[PDB]
Design an enzyme around this catalytic site. Structure first.
Site, short mmCIF file in Angstrom:
data_model
loop_
_atom_site.label_atom_id
_atom_site.label_comp_id
_atom_site.label_asym_id
_atom_site.label_seq_id
_atom_site.Cartn_x
_atom_site.Cartn_y
_atom_site.Cartn_z
N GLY A 97 0.79 -1.23 0.00
CA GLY A 97 0.00 0.00 0.00
C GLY A 97 0.82 1.28 0.00
CE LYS A 114 3.59 1.34 -5.62
NZ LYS A 114 3.50 0.35 -4.50
CG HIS A 116 10.93 15.03 3.02
ND1 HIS A 116 10.93 16.40 2.80
CD2 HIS A 116 10.06 14.51 2.12
CE1 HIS A 116 10.11 16.68 1.81
NE2 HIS A 116 9.57 15.55 1.38
CG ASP A 169 10.48 16.22 -4.03
OD1 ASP A 169 9.36 16.43 -3.52
OD2 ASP A 169 10.98 15.08 -4.11
CG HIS A 226 6.49 16.60 -0.81
ND1 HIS A 226 6.56 15.43 -1.53
CD2 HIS A 226 5.19 16.74 -0.46
CE1 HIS A 226 5.36 14.89 -1.61
NE2 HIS A 226 4.51 15.67 -0.97
CG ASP A 239 7.37 14.57 -5.60
OD1 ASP A 239 8.09 15.46 -6.09
OD2 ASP A 239 7.42 14.26 -4.39
NE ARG A 250 -0.78 5.31 -8.40
CZ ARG A 250 -1.62 4.97 -9.38
NH1 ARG A 250 -2.64 5.76 -9.71
NH2 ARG A 250 -1.43 3.84 -10.05
K LIG Z 1 11.13 21.58 -3.40
ZN LIG Z 2 8.37 14.90 -2.81
#
Ligand SMILES: [K+]
Ligand SMILES: [Zn+2]
Ligand SMILES: [K+]
Ligand SMILES: [K+]
Ligand SMILES: [K+]
Ligand SMILES: [Zn+2]
EC number: 3.5.1.98
Lengths: 161, 369, 161, 369
Positions: free
Chosen positions: D20, D24, D134, D169, D171, D257, D263
């Site tokens: 889940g 990956k 992160h 990225d 994030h 991402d 996703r």
């Molecule tokens: K960033």
């Molecule tokens: Zn990210």
């Protein structure tokens, strides 16, 4: 049952050349070399190359039965062609392998046995069962688009199976 | 070790004499294929002979015998019928498609190898296509149209004073004999079946004529000769020949029809005994020319010449036949060697010695010191 | 949602090395080279070699479906192995081909997709249809003789067919 | 043309986070396989990174955070539960079999390439396994356990006075920011979604502290940003960054991402627009370190990094995907490029310019001439 004497029977004996006289024979017009016995290669490398030549063969006929195609590529035509390939490339393994795969594409070598169609092989068996081993008639009546020499080659190969 | 040159053209095995005919040229291709897979091909210099033209074919034959052969085809077969009887082409020696090309490969192989020998660039030279010895100056006899052997010898007479010809074929080598019947520069030695056989010549009293008298050795034989009988008469005679005739080049015709179980032959020789001759001749270290000839149980013909090539390279080959395109031809056994048959040897020791002694005398007639 | 300051948050900044001081790092303990970009070879020769590598592959799996085995030998594992073979043999085509056929015998390279048995592939599909994508349980209960990493590799390859 | 070094270990694609889970690692193997078949692999120096040991992992991280990671397994998971809450390993960042080895390959790749850059033996170095941003000094956050980027930069600070870090990225790159929050030797520039998103940091007013004040650039963004919007804000800002901060080595995190149809992400960028950043950064001809990061529609992740490697080699690749082991993954189309969605861009020109001007001011606060 008699041996004859006379000018119409004996050969004119060729006289021995003087130490200053030369035979005057062009060797190129008599022969062309196909394999040198004294190579920079070892029995191992040649053996390996013949495996590679066979491998390229099977892969080729994979690109338009696995044991069938491998056995097909193992037949003497491919082997003989491989030996020639080595000689023509001055026994350079690297160079000779490029000759097997000219432009990223493999080479096929098929003898008359493998080469004939399913219907041509069928025509051959009918012609044989009917006309015996009379190969001029076998072509004249059953396979007139094939050359006589190819029908001979095919026959002897077919005699195995 | 002696250097060997092998002569072959891919076409030779595809010429076909005719339906029902015993002479099957395919046997050469069989040998060839075995030679590859036994790994012998690898060990000798391989040459493709270029076709031999009418030019050098007439260095012995008639200008109008070769001209007949070059012209004759299965087309004009009913047109030539007059000349067909004169040259003996049509029954004993049949007309077939490709006939002349077959003569060109057979002759080309022999000549190119003779030149190769004269040029001193090989010790042994091999041509299984050649060795066709029944051919005469103006006619085809016993499946032979062009006598490649004569032409091969005529080229060797250019560099060699004395050329020895040895002939193991079951049939008497009359072509090579007749062609050199009146010369002392070439000695022809022959071992054959005699008595209701072909070609009806080569008896004890066949010695030669003129300058060629005492220079044509002949060993007439009856049925069923052993390897043991053959060896015990071949070595003594040839030793004496070398001793007396003192040659500087040998031409060995290795006719395979003297083998046991032959379709046309009626001797009882194995490949091993047959090869012992090649080996013995090889031992005299003379520029050697190995040719084929007859042989009509082709399985064995292929076996024979395969083995005899190993003899020239003096390498060992196993009795296990290597896999090849014709592997399935070779019985349930798939072996190289044949063994002799229950056949009775009609060559009694008294008979062989009677002849042997007459030949030793004839050889003593030559000059020596 | 906050950024923090302090010795327990910021990194100790590595000081710049003096012109006389050296970093003291062993490169071997960090990396090993797998392919040099600057070869004596051309795109053509490498392309040819990859055909040969594929050919040897199909012939190998012929020695214990023709399109099937060719496609099998065409898969990335064989290709990657071929690239490595070139590099390990210092980009000598002749030498690198001998590495493919060590003793007159070819080399097989099979990924987990091709490698698994008929029953193992069947076990996988049952395990997937039952336990979803829980691969630790898929092994623990269905394929406990396989390593988890192999089951992952196999899964992704199976996702194609 | 610039020389490129690629870092990959075959194992990386076989580590699995859990059922889940969005992260990956297989996506790296997909990229790898495409790189081979597009013929790009052929064109760059390929290295296998040796595992990075606890030794160099602690050059930034806690002696007892790494010691926890080296020890934690799915076995002793119910034994460690106390430390699992302290380090945030177990839910946000799950425990899985092989976890530490995955960190060793990710870190090893980044470090080995940094050394490669310092040793001046490459112009570009690529590690798609790394870029995990992160991770903090004493805890795992947002699927990142070991901050390979920090360690990569710490090695570059040995030969380079000023190291620039750029992060695409979606994030906010808080790990790399926090780790260098109080230094002027490393500038961290970030472009991300802000507002009910993760990691909750990196707003306009995020500027740094102490010596590091005015050295942590941040560009907060809303949903649906275009290639066109992104480009028109990325180039002006980075030009000013290069102009002011004057770096001698760049480290670009190419988090995938921020791509359209992600996703987890909610931007509307195509591979082409995303790569325009790589290309633009490449143009400044500085020792460059390209790393991966997030990306959760793996088909596109593979597409993205495949393409962006072609950018580093500046070679042209066709939109037709070459056949590979995972060819069937790529829809009915089998193409490299994605196009943008009908998604609405909530980043109005007035909003982007408002922020842009505040950042230009913050950058003017640096010393120059
Ligand atoms: K960033
Ligand atoms: Zn990210
Ligand atoms: K005889
Ligand atoms: K005579
Ligand atoms: K900073
Ligand atoms: Zn005979």
């Amino acid at each position: 049952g008699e041996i004859r004497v006379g000018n119409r029977y004996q050969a004119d004996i060729t006289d021995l050349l003087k130490e200053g006289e030369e035979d005057g024979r062009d060797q190129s017009r008599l022969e062309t070399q196909v394999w040198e016995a004294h190579n920079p290669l070892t029995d191992k490398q040649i053996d390996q190359f013949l495996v590679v030549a066979r491998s390229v063969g099977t892969f080729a006929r994979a690109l338009d039965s696995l044991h069938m195609s491998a056995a097909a590529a193992s037949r003497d035509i491919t082997l003989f062609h491989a030996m020639d390939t080595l000689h023509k490339n001055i026994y350079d393994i690297s160079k000779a392998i490029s000759a097997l795969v000219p432009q990223g594409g493999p080479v096929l070598c098929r003898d008359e046995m493998e080469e004939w169609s399913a219907s041509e092989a069928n025509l051959f068996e009918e012609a044989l069962e009917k006309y015996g081993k009379d190969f001029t008639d076998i072509q004249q009546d059953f396979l007139p688009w094939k050359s006589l020499t190819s029908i001979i080659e095919y026959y002897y190969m077919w005699k195995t199976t | 070790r002696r250097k060997v040159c092998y002569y072959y053209d891919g076409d030779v095995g595809n010429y076909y004499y005719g339906q029902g005919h015993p002479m099957k040229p395919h046997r050469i291709r069989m040998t060839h294929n075995l030679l590859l897979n036994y790994g012998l091909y690898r060990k000798m210099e391989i040459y493709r002979p270029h076709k031999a033209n009418a030019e050098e074919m007439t260095k012995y034959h008639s200008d109008d015998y070769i001209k007949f052969l070059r012209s004759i085809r299965p087309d004009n077969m009913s047109e030539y019928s007059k000349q067909m009887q004169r040259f003996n082409v049509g029954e004993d020696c049949p007309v077939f498609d490709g006939l002349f090309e077959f003569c060109q490969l057979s002759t080309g192989g022999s000549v190119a190898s003779a030149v190769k020998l004269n040029k001193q660039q090989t010790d042994i030279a091999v041509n299984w296509a050649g060795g066709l010895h029944h051919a005469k100056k103006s006619e085809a006899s016993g499946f032979c149209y062009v006598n490649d052997i004569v032409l091969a010898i005529l080229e060797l007479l250019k560099y060699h004073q004395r050329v020895l010809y040895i002939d193991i074929d079951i049939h008497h080598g009359d072509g090579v004999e007749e062609a050199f019947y009146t010369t002392d520069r070439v000695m022809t030695v022959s071992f054959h079946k005699y008595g209701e056989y072909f070609p009806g010549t080569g008896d004890l009293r066949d010695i030669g004529a003129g300058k060629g008298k005492y220079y044509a050795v002949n060993y007439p034989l009856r049925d069923g000769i052993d390897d043991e009988s053959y060896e015990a008469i071949f070595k003594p005679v040839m030793s004496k020949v070398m001793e007396m005739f003192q040659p500087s080049a040998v031409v060995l015709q290795c006719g395979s029809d003297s083998l046991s179980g032959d379709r046309l032959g009626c001797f009882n020789l194995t490949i091993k005994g047959h090869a012992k001759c090649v080996e013995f001749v090889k031992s005299f270290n003379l520029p050697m020319l190995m040719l084929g000839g007859g042989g009509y149980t082709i399985r064995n013909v292929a076996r024979c010449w395969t083995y005899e090539t190993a003899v020239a390279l003096d390498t060992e080959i196993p009795n296990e036949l290597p896999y090849n395109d014709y592997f399935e031809y070779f019985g349930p056994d798939f072996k190289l060697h044949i063994s002799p048959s229950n056949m009775t040897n009609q060559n009694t020791n008294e008979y062989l010695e009677k002849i042997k002694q007459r030949l030793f005398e004839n050889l003593r007639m030559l000059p020596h010191a």
